[PDB]
C-alpha cells in the first residue's frame, strides 16, 4: 500500500509509460526553462502533457489511492488524456476501452476497479519505482514533494491531481494560436505561481517533464 | 489626493519627460509576457516595468499618487536616462551631496519635492483615453515597479512600509528586464490570483527607447 517515490527522470517516466502502452515514438523529456526561446529549441514539439514536481505548498481523472504513487498517476493522467499516443491492445488502452464500453466512470476513476488495475501495474513494475540517478528512500517515508499534470482536452486546460478530492481543476479555455501546451499562457501562469512561493521560501525543489515526440 | 493615473504610455511618458527623462526614452505597452513575436515589436532594453493590478525607494504620501511614485521608482533607479540639470536629477543629487536619505526617501525634502511635482502637473493626472474619477474615490488598483539594480532585482511599492523588496539576483544572459525569470514569475503569481477571481484588471508598461 506504499510505493517508493518515483524520480523526476525522463528515462524512468518514459520506461513506465512505454510499459503502460505509450507508443515508442513518444517520450518524456526535461523541461528546464519555461519561458525561454533558445532552450525550447532543444525541446521536442508538440508537448502533449506537462508533469510538474513541487512541494505541497470533460477529461479523465484518477483518484490517488496508493501512498507515494503520485508519479504513476501523473503518467496515467498524461497518457489517458492522450489516447491517440497509446498502442492498441496495451494494458492502459485495454483498461480505458473496458470502462467506456461498460460506461462505469466515464471520466472519474475512483473505483475499486481502478485500484486493482493500478495495484497490478505497481506489482509488475516495483523495481522501476527505485531506478534513477538519486538513491531510493523507503516507501514508508514522506517526501513533501508531489507530482501533478497539465493537458488540453476538448478545448480546455486542466490541472490533474490525484489528491485533489474535488477532482480535475479547470484552468480556462485553450488558445488555438498555441502550437502546443508550452504555448498556453494559462499553464505558464499557473506554474509560475507555484515557483513564486518557492522563490520566497528559498526552495529549489521543482522539476518539470514534458511528453513529446522521440 | 490626486486623480488616479491611467495606464497609458503617452501619459507616463509625458510625466516622465517633464521630470527629466531624456527624450530618447519612453514608456510603452506590454501586452504579452512570454511570447516571441510580440517581443520583436517592444523596444529593448526595457529598463523598468510598471504593473497595474488589484536602490532608491520612496514612501507614498499622497492618495492616488501611486502611478507618479512608480514613475519616480522607474526613473530614480535609472539615473543615466535623466537629463543632467532636470528637476529629478537635481533632487536626487542634492540628497546624495547632503547624504539625507541615501535611498529611503520619507523626509520633508522629499514630500515637498513631490507635492511640487504634483502641483506643477495637476492637469496631466486627468489625461488619457478614459474618464477621470474623483481623486476622493478609491480605485482598488495599484501601481508597482520592477528594476534591475546592482544585479539585484527589486519590486518597489510606495505603500510597502518595509521598503523595497529584493526578489533575488539577476540573470546576465538577459539583455533586459523582460528576460528576467524572477520578474515574470513574480508578475505571473499576481495574475494567477486574478485568473481564479475572474478579474481582468491588469496592465503593464515598459520604459525603453523611443
Amino acid at each position: 500500500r506504499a510505493v517508493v517515490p518515483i524520480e523526476s527522470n525522463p528515462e524512468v517516466f518514459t520506461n513506465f509509460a512505454h510499459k503502460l502502452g505509450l507508443k515508442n515514438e513518444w517520450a518524456y523529456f526535461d523541461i528546464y526553462s519555461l519561458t525561454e526561446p533558445e532552450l525550447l529549441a532543444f525541446l521536442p514539439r508538440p508537448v502533449k502533457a506537462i508533469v510538474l514536481l513541487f512541494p505541497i505548498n470533460d477529461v479523465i481523472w484518477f483518484k490517488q489511492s496508493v501512498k507515494n504513487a503520485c508519479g504513476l498517476y501523473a503518467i496515467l493522467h498524461s497518457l489517458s488524456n492522450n489516447q491517440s499516443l497509446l498502442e492498441p491492445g496495451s494494458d492502459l488502452d485495454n483498461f480505458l476501452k473496458s470502462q467506456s464500453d461498460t460506461s462505469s466512470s466515464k471520466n472519474r476513476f475512483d473505483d475499486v476497479t481502478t485500484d486493482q488495475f493500478v495495484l497490478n501495474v505497481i506489482k509488475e513494475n516495483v523495481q522501476t519505482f527505485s531506478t534513477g540517478q538519486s538513491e531510493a528512500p523507503e516507501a514508508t517515508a514522506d517526501t513533501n514533494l508531489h507530482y501533478i499534470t497539465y493537458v488540453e482536452e476538448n478545448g480546455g486546460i486542466f490541472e490533474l491531481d490525484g489528491r485533489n478530492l474535488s477532482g480535475p481543476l479547470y484552468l480556462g479555455k485553450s488558445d488555438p494560436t498555441a502550437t502546443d501546451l508550452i504555448e498556453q499562457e494559462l499553464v505558464r501562469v499557473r506554474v509560475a505561481s507555484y515557483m513564486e512561493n518557492a522563490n520566497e521560501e528559498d526552495v529549489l525543489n521543482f522539476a518539470m517533464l514534458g511528453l513529446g515526440p522521440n | 489626493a490626486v486623480v488616479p493615473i491611467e495606464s497609458n504610455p503617452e501619459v507616463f511618458t509625458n510625466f516622465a519627460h517633464k521630470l527629466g527623462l531624456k527624450n530618447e526614452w519612453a514608456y510603452f505597452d506590454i501586452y504579452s509576457l512570454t511570447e516571441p513575436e510580440l517581443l520583436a515589436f517592444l523596444p529593448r532594453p526595457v529598463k523598468a516595468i510598471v504593473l497595474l493590478f488589484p536602490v532608491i525607494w520612496f514612501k507614498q504620501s499622497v492618495k492616488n499618487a501611486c502611478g507618479l511614485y512608480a514613475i519616480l521608482h522607474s526613473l530614480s533607479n535609472n539615473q543615466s536616462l535623466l537629463e543632467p540639470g532636470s528637476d529629478l536629477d537635481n533632487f536626487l543629487k542634492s540628497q546624495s551631496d547632503t547624504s539625507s536619505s541615501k535611498n529611503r526617501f520619507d523626509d520633508v525634502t522629499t514630500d515637498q519635492f513631490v507635492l511640487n511635482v504634483i502641483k506643477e502637473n495637476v492637469q496631466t493626472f486627468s489625461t488619457g483615453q478614459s474618464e477621470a474619477p474623483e481623486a476622493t474615490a478609491d480605485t482598488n488598483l495599484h501601481y508597482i515597479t520592477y528594476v534591475e539594480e546592482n544585479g539585484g532585482i527589486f519590486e518597489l511599492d510606495g505603500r510597502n512600509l518595509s521598503g523595497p523588496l529584493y526578489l533575488g539576483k539577476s540573470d546576465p544572459t538577459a539583455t533586459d528586464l523582460i528576460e528576467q525569470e524572477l520578474v515574470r514569475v513574480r508578475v505571473a503569481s499576481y495574475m494567477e490570483n486574478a485568473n481564479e477571481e475572474d478579474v481582468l484588471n491588469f496592465a503593464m508598461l515598459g520604459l525603453g527607447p523611443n
Binding site: 494560436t177 | 490626486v2 502611478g67 488598483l141 501601481y143 495574475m191 486574478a194 491588469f202 503593464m204
Partner: peptide, 17 residues
C-alpha cells in the same frame, strides 16, 4: 487575448492609485 492569459485592440487603460 488578454494580458492574464477602457480598451485598446486587448490592452486595458485603467486608473490606479
Amino acid at each position: 487575448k488578454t494580458l492574464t492569459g477602457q480598451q485598446r485592440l486587448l490592452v486595458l487603460r485603467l486608473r490606479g492609485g
